[PDB]
Amino acid sequence: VNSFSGYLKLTDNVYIKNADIVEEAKKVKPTVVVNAANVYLKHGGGVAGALNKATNNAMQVESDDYIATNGPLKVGGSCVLSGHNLAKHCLHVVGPNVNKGEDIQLLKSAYENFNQHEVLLAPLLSAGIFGADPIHSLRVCVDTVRTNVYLAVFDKNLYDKLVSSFL
């Protein structure tokens, strides 16, 4: 048993809810929250900028030190940093940016990072401002992640569409 509430069970291990990941994280304080990041860990907008704003920019300060030491992430890669006031840990995961010409087949690689964590709160990767279709993103997730993933979908129209079109 875990503390995630009102989630709609989609498969053995994938759950979905119409919720803002920032508000979900603040309420649940999960072991792992996933950030949909970029290779530079530049959290200006979207999930990244919203989580970072919720940390009062502490996520960005920590991220800048990480990059100065280690250099950029790979598209499809990840790093574990602090969850600040939102979670124990933040798993920063880079899905492909299809508006940058980045291989959509790297989205599966992005979601493989989730398998290193038994339970995660996560958004849909590569959709929204990375240009890919949310319906496709949810499909890749279900077919790749084997650990227990709680998906917070911010847009109600999309959530209703993701559920209604789920095979």
Ligand SMILES: CO[C@@H]1CN(c2ncnc3[nH]c4cc(F)ccc4c23)C[C@@H](CO)O1
């Ligand atoms: C489909 O992928 C992304 C997922 N994203 C979110 N998902 C879950 N919770 C979210 N809270 C937010 C607060 C914000 F200010 C901005 C975005 C979100 C958000 C919505 C959109 C962002 O571009 O697309």
